[PDB]
Amino acid sequence: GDWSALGKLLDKVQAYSTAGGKVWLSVLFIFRILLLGTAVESAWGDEQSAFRCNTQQPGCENVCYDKSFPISHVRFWVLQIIFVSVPTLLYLAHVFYVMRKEEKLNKKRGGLLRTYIISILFKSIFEVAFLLIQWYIYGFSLSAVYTCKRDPCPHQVDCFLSRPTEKTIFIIFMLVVSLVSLALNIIELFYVFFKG
Amino acid sequence: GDWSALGKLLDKVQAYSTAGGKVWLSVLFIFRILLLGTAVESAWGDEQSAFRCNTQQPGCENVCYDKSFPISHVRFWVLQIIFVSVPTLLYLAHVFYVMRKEEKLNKKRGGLLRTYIISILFKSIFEVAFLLIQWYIYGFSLSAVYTCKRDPCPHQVDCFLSRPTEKTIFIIFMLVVSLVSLALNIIELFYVFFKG
Amino acid sequence: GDWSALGKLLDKVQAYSTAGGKVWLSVLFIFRILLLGTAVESAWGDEQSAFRCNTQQPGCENVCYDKSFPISHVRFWVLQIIFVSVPTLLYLAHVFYVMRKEEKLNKKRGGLLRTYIISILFKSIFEVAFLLIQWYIYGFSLSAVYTCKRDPCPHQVDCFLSRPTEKTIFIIFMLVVSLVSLALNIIELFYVFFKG
Amino acid sequence: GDWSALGKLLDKVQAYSTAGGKVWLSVLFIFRILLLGTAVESAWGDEQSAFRCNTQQPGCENVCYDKSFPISHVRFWVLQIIFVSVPTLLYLAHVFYVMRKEEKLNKKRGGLLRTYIISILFKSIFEVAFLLIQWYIYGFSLSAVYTCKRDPCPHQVDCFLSRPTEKTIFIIFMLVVSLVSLALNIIELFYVFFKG
Amino acid sequence: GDWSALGKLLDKVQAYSTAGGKVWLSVLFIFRILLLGTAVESAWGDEQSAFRCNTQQPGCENVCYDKSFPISHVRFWVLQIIFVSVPTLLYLAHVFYVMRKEEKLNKKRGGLLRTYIISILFKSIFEVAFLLIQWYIYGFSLSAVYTCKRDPCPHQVDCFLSRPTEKTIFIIFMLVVSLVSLALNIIELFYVFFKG
Amino acid sequence: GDWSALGKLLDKVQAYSTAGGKVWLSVLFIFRILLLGTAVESAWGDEQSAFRCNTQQPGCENVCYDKSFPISHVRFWVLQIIFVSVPTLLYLAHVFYVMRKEEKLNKKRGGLLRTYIISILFKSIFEVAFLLIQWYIYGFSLSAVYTCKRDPCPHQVDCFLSRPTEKTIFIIFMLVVSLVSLALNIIELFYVFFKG
Ligand SMILES: CCCCCCCCCCCCCC
Ligand SMILES: CCCCCCCCCCCCCC
Ligand SMILES: CCCCCCCCCCCCCC
Ligand SMILES: CCCCCCCCCCCCCC
Ligand SMILES: CCCCCCCCCCCCCC
Ligand SMILES: CCCCCCCCCCCCCC
Ligand SMILES: CCCCCCCCCCCCCC
Ligand SMILES: CCCCCCCCCCCCCC
Ligand SMILES: CCCCCCCCCCCCCC
Ligand SMILES: CCCCCCCCCCCCCC
Ligand SMILES: CCCCCCCCCCCCCC
Ligand SMILES: CCCCCCCCCCCCCC
Ligand SMILES: CCCCCCCCCCCCCC
Ligand SMILES: CCCCCCCCCCCCCC
Ligand SMILES: CCCCCCCCCCCCCC
Ligand SMILES: CCCCCCCCCCCCCC
Ligand SMILES: CCCCCCCCCCCCCC
Ligand SMILES: CCCCCCCCCCCCCC
Ligand SMILES: CCCCCCCCCCCCCC
Ligand SMILES: CCCCCCCCCCCCCC
Ligand SMILES: CCCCCCCCCCCCCC
Ligand SMILES: CCCCCCCCCCCCCC
Ligand SMILES: CCCCCCCCCCCCCC
Ligand SMILES: CCCCCCCCCCCCCC
Ligand SMILES: CCCCCCCCCCCCCC
Ligand SMILES: CCCCCCCCCCCCCC
Ligand SMILES: CCCCCCCCCCCCCC
Ligand SMILES: CCCCCCCCCCCCCC
Ligand SMILES: CCCCCCCCCCCCCC
Ligand SMILES: CCCCCCCCCCCCCC
Ligand SMILES: CCCCCCCCCCCCCC
Ligand SMILES: CCCCCCCCCCCCCC
Ligand SMILES: CCCCCCCCCCCCCC
Ligand SMILES: CCCCCCCCCCCCCC
Ligand SMILES: CCCCCCCCCCCCCC
Ligand SMILES: CCCCCCCCCCCCCC
Ligand SMILES: CCCCCCCCCCCCCC
Ligand SMILES: CCCCCCCCCCCCCC
Ligand SMILES: CCCCCCCCCCCCCC
Ligand SMILES: CCCCCCCCCCCCCC
Ligand SMILES: CCCCCCCCCCCCCC
Ligand SMILES: CCCCCCCCCCCCCC
Ligand SMILES: CCCCCCCCCCCCCC
Ligand SMILES: CCCCCCCCCCCCCC
Ligand SMILES: CCCCCCCCCCCCCC
Numbered sequence A, B, C, D, E, F: 001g002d003w004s005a006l007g008k009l010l011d012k013v014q015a016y017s018t019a020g021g022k023v024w025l026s027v028l029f030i031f032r033i034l035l036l037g038t039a040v041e042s043a044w045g046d047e048q049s050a051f052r053c054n055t056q057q058p059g060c061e062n063v064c065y066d067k068s069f070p071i072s073h074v075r076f077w078v079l080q081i082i083f084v085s086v087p088t089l090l091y092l093a094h095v096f097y098v099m100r101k102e103e104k105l106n107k108k109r110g111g112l113l114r115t116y117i118i119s120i121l122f123k124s125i126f127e128v129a130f131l132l133i134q135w136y137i138y139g140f141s142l143s144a145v146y147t148c149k150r151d152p153c154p155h156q157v158d159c160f161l162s163r164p165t166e167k168t169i170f171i172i173f174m175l176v177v178s179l180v181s182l183a184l185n186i187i188e189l190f191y192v193f194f195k196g
Helices: A004-012 A021-040 A060-068 A073-103 A113-137 A164-193 B004-012 B021-040 B060-068 B073-103 B113-137 B164-193 C004-012 C021-040 C060-068 C073-103 C113-137 C164-193 D004-012 D021-040 D060-068 D073-103 D113-137 D164-193 E004-012 E021-040 E060-068 E073-103 E113-137 E164-193 F004-012 F021-040 F060-068 F073-103 F113-137 F164-193
Strands: A145-148 A157-160 B145-148 B157-160 C145-148 C157-160 D145-148 D157-160 E145-148 E157-160 F145-148 F157-160
Touching (some): A004 A073, A021 B073, A060 A157, A060 F164, B021 B073, B060 B145, B073 B164, B113 B164, C021 C073, C021 D073, C060 C145, D073 D113, D164 E060, E021 E164, E021 F073, E060 E157, E073 E164, F073 F164
Antiparallel strands (some): B145 B157, D145 D157, E145 E157, F145 F157
């Protein structure tokens, strides 16, 4: 029965948003979690135990695997999803204490709106930042043969990845679902400015 | 005691459905989850660690396994089940905010119905889409010997899968339970049109 | 405090059953789950990683293991337990919406009974069906040496299973607890007919 | 607030027991679970993967491990603990429906007592039964060298177990805690008879 | 709202304790659990799979590992923490039924205090008992080389442990946090006697 | 509905803090947990199973791995996060019993403030202590080749770590998020003194 006070909190947090963003993005947050922790986490399980290279030099598979994967895509997308969720969480924690301050006033314009704008800016700005890093480093694909030239391997060794194509499809899903997230925040950002 | 408000929400979401779909499909959603995450998830555990090929060429088992399995059936069926559930979830989130908008009206035809129709269309349309992809790629069976002709293997190598018959039976269950899902949405789709 | 409405639902679902079936079968459902997911699931963990055969032919252990186990007993008994539980779940979901239809009637014989009979028939009929399949395929024991004659092995190879005796005892428990389930539904089936 | 009805159910189930059994056995049930599923389950993890024998005969470690362990002690003690708990659970489910039958009587001697006696008999009788089986099979110790004479091994092979002493200490705890359970039910059994 | 009855139970259990023990020991119970099941449980994961010895004698690593570790420190500290918690749990279960007996008296000195004294004695007495056993067996350190002289190894073999220094630091934490537990119960024990 | 009493407890614990620390640090506690147990725990999974050294000397990989990692970074950061959380937990448990003492007074300055100051001091003081230890031992990086000179290896051996660069990035995140924690407690510490 104590959900009646929670109804006031979920109303005031989304009083400035449209009728289409709170139904599409909230499902998109549930979608991105359920894709990440259930389907694709088990896919990157043997990212190192199957990585075989064509040499006898001991440790050459240790230093060549790292050059291909400075940071794996799974711990990348977990690093991304907290950074896109944290401006919403920070706005949620602030609006709760603001509501509590006003409940202890009545029994004995523009202040809330600025941080609501900033909360959607850093949602996109971190999202563009994590995309171009992936283009700068990994691209949006995976080749089935890597040629490695680090030390202490000899001249050039051939290292064969573990499931390039299965890792390819879940990369493009993480590109598309992030890109439809990015456009879905931009359309809110026009609506808050064009109101006046 | 706060389930009385939830009783109004579960009534309005299924006010257009028949008396037979909400009892058969809701159990079919519980059935498909319980078959997937409990029985058949452990069956595809060693999909790569048992895949042995008949060669000495290093990495030939890495590139030949991929040609047989571009995407494994388990991460396929998890990818399918979210896409069939998401039009129901999207209709659920929309009808909640529509109900909340009308609760803040009375204390101080055709609008809901169109998206209810669209919500059942994309349930079937994604379901037909995922079936024919499996026929285009994997078929509905698994052979116990795969002949591989990728690079850098030699001329032709023999690769032996891991449990073809146990993977065969759970494929046909995922075909049958998806097909009885597909017919169970079609029978609703006639009933909403033939009402008038 | 909202368990008072749940008290009406658990009364009407078992208004036709005896005083002895709802206390013995409900514990038997808790018993079969707790035996399956806690004790015997870990026993069939290394069903493939310990299966060794007496040959050098690569992949001969892959194709010979399958002939011994087309479907493992653990994923068999999980497949069985959902099929015996689903007619009870389907009767539970139907009787809830029937109760809700009558609650929206009073504020502004024989119909329920037929599907209650059918719900106990398919509990036994699926149970007899899964038993004879095991007799047709696996029997009710496990021998400690399997002789395999599939391809591409040579003439005949000896393959040694993993824990035949520990798998033997839990098979007989799954035979006995299923058989005492089968007789406990039959005794209900006489009581509903002999009432008149 | 709906724990007030649960207070009547936990009173009537233990109206015939002493003030010392419901405080000592209920903690003993919590003790035996917490010892089993947390401490000693991880100890029997590598019961097969460390079992090495002194031969080259392939599969000789498969058939010799079984003769030493027809059923492992962990799946034995899980099999024991359900059988000692099931007469208490069966008495709990029966006394609930008996209470419900009398609640639907008042708004519009000796019957309960017999099954309470039987419920404590089968607690001890199954407990004595599982103890002597262990004495008939395993004893109450483990030797660090097993001599195996099964087929298809040669004349006699030496097989070395995995952690005999760590498995020895948890056997004696499972003997002592079962024996203090057995005496704690007997002392109740005198008290119910000597009341008259 | 039914926490008001729980407020009476948590008051009467600690009516004889000081204002400093219920705030320091209750956090110390939360600390010792969170250190044990989260940090140091994963540290002792490969206690056997990394234990390598310097011989070819088959099974010599099985019988030499046991002499170094008759019982591992993790299953020791889990065995300790239940024994220090069980006198508090036994006093909690007794004081609940004592409270229930007096609630069924008013609607139609020295008795509680003795078992409160005994409950703190066996907390320390078991704690001193488990400490000196560790000094009698393991000491409070771990050496990086063990020399083994059991059978059927030859004259003397060198066995190298798995992470001695990481296991050293968590031993001293389990010594310090147990010792600050032991002094924190003694200071209560003076306060109950010196009251009179 | 019993969250109304919890509203008084969460008000009195933070009556001396600013409006910016309770919204930024509480999210920072949720951030550091979610980074630790989800993203970086799986990264340090094979910290030993991939550590290969360039020798044939048995056990040389056991004693050389330890010199590189006396305590792994994951069990370090878990050891850190409990020590920074424990002064907040201790202040939470104390303020609850202080509130309960005053509730049993009214139905029949400076005392709280001192321990609030001490609770923030030991948050920073333990945080500076764990940082400089890492600088004294590990630094803030990881090199891809370790040269080992322990016994019983020969003169000098080369040991290659497992993923130095992926472990490098999560170290700097654990430095930055700890450092922004350290400055966020200092800014509170000025505010409590400069109030008067
Ligand atoms: C009385 C009607 C108001 C009840 C509001 C409850 C909805 C808020 C919960 C939304 C989050 C649920 C996550 C599953
Ligand atoms: C690798 C396992 C992934 C499991 C899910 C990851 C959850 C991390 C994001 C949680 C954000 C919650 C914000 C409210
Ligand atoms: C060794 C060659 C250079 C490697 C640089 C890797 C940079 C990866 C940066 C990832 C940043 C993700 C968190 C913002
Ligand atoms: C009075 C202070 C309120 C702070 C509310 C949070 C504002 C948005 C913070 C966004 C941080 C973006 C970088 C991670
Ligand atoms: C009345 C609303 C209760 C549920 C709110 C849950 C989120 C509150 C913000 C989370 C951080 C607050 C610090 C405890
Ligand atoms: C009204 C409250 C204003 C809050 C200001 C916060 C602005 C963002 C500061 C942090 C940006 C850089 C974070 C890495
Ligand atoms: C030294 C070359 C490293 C190249 C990758 C650097 C990644 C740094 C990420 C910083 C993120 C800044 C977001 C505004
Ligand atoms: C007062 C009667 C109305 C109560 C309605 C409760 C039923 C709605 C819950 C259905 C989902 C339950 C999932 C297990
Ligand atoms: C591979 C493990 C499978 C576990 C179950 C998968 C659940 C994913 C579907 C959840 C959809 C929920 C919609 C309400
Ligand atoms: C390498 C030969 C071509 C492989 C193509 C594989 C296509 C798999 C498509 C799966 C799509 C599932 C998500 C819609
Ligand atoms: C006002 C907007 C309401 C939106 C409700 C959801 C409609 C159905 C969306 C189905 C999406 C199908 C493609 C995944
Ligand atoms: C009153 C109903 C509460 C339970 C509803 C749970 C589903 C609501 C839709 C889920 C998304 C809403 C965004 C928080
Ligand atoms: C009344 C609300 C209408 C909603 C329109 C949504 C139609 C579907 C658009 C997305 C289809 C393509 C998704 C891949
Ligand atoms: C390049 C050849 C790839 C063949 C498989 C392509 C699969 C694409 C799936 C698109 C789904 C569209 C659903 C309407
Ligand atoms: C060569 C032997 C192949 C065996 C295939 C067995 C197929 C069984 C399908 C079971 C489906 C049952 C539908 C209810
Ligand atoms: C007021 C008395 C009626 C309360 C009925 C509660 C019993 C129904 C629950 C039975 C299932 C419990 C599973 C653990
Ligand atoms: C292999 C792990 C087994 C875990 C338990 C299996 C549960 C499946 C049966 C659940 C049926 C629930 C019907 C109400
Ligand atoms: C390859 C030789 C024939 C194998 C047939 C295996 C049939 C197994 C049928 C199991 C059916 C279980 C689901 C009904
Ligand atoms: C009006 C329709 C009610 C349906 C209730 C369920 C009847 C029993 C179905 C049993 C199915 C057995 C085959 C799995
Ligand atoms: C009032 C009873 C609430 C609990 C009932 C739980 C089972 C209801 C049937 C489950 C399927 C209903 C579809 C949501
Ligand atoms: C009164 C409701 C009657 C329901 C009829 C259902 C009978 C069973 C039909 C399905 C049997 C075959 C399932 C494989
Ligand atoms: C082709 C030979 C296969 C032999 C096993 C067939 C099993 C089919 C199971 C069908 C179940 C029907 C239950 C009524
Ligand atoms: C109003 C006082 C009666 C409340 C009775 C609650 C005690 C019954 C619960 C005992 C089992 C608890 C298991 C943790
Ligand atoms: C091997 C893992 C053991 C986990 C605990 C086993 C629990 C089985 C006994 C449960 C009996 C519950 C009776 C109420
Ligand atoms: C192969 C030599 C005879 C082996 C007999 C093993 C008997 C084990 C009986 C265990 C019974 C436990 C359940 C009652
Ligand atoms: C009217 C029937 C009541 C049955 C209550 C249970 C009696 C005790 C059964 C004990 C079974 C012991 C063998 C497992
Ligand atoms: C009013 C008491 C509710 C809680 C009782 C939980 C145990 C009831 C017996 C369990 C089997 C009953 C079949 C649903
Ligand atoms: C008053 C109820 C009497 C119940 C009789 C049950 C006696 C035990 C019968 C089963 C004993 C054999 C089980 C293996
Ligand atoms: C064939 C020799 C087997 C020896 C072990 C038999 C164990 C049978 C257990 C039966 C339990 C009976 C309890 C009353
Ligand atoms: C009305 C005020 C009394 C409420 C008492 C609640 C505190 C007792 C719970 C202490 C244990 C909590 C463990 C997290
Ligand atoms: C090895 C995993 C350790 C997990 C925590 C162990 C908990 C055992 C102690 C629980 C005592 C509870 C007393 C109330
Ligand atoms: C084989 C040499 C003697 C080994 C004796 C080991 C004794 C360990 C006793 C541990 C007792 C812990 C529970 C009280
Ligand atoms: C009337 C009996 C009350 C018993 C309460 C518990 C007393 C303390 C028992 C401590 C046992 C210490 C040895 C484990
Ligand atoms: C009214 C208090 C309910 C919660 C008490 C939980 C502990 C009670 C003692 C635990 C053993 C009691 C046997 C069921
Ligand atoms: C007032 C209740 C007295 C309880 C007496 C219990 C004393 C301890 C007896 C057990 C000590 C030995 C346990 C191993
Ligand atoms: C036979 C030599 C064994 C040496 C270790 C014995 C440990 C026994 C522990 C008994 C604990 C007694 C506590 C009072
Ligand atoms: C090598 C062994 C070193 C042991 C040092 C620990 C001695 C006890 C220190 C903790 C005392 C705390 C008293 C409050
Ligand atoms: C009636 C309004 C007061 C309700 C206070 C609830 C907020 C306190 C909970 C904060 C912690 C939530 C963690 C998710
Ligand atoms: C290695 C797995 C990490 C899992 C999370 C660790 C949690 C430990 C910190 C919990 C502190 C809670 C304070 C309230
Ligand atoms: C073997 C060379 C000296 C190794 C010393 C390692 C010291 C590590 C100290 C870590 C302390 C962390 C807990 C405070
Ligand atoms: C009356 C005693 C109150 C104690 C409250 C806790 C004070 C802060 C303790 C901080 C301990 C720091 C070292 C871990
Ligand atoms: C009324 C507040 C109940 C919830 C408080 C939870 C934290 C209380 C302090 C935790 C230690 C108290 C010892 C049981
Ligand atoms: C007002 C309460 C004062 C509490 C004093 C606690 C001061 C800190 C003592 C412990 C410091 C050393 C811990 C390792
Ligand atoms: C013997 C050399 C060891 C060097 C590391 C010592 C670490 C000790 C940590 C003590 C922490 C004290 C915090 C105030
Ligand atoms: C030799 C290449 C080393 C690459 C080091 C990359 C360091 C990246 C640090 C990212 C920290 C971002 C802070 C927000």
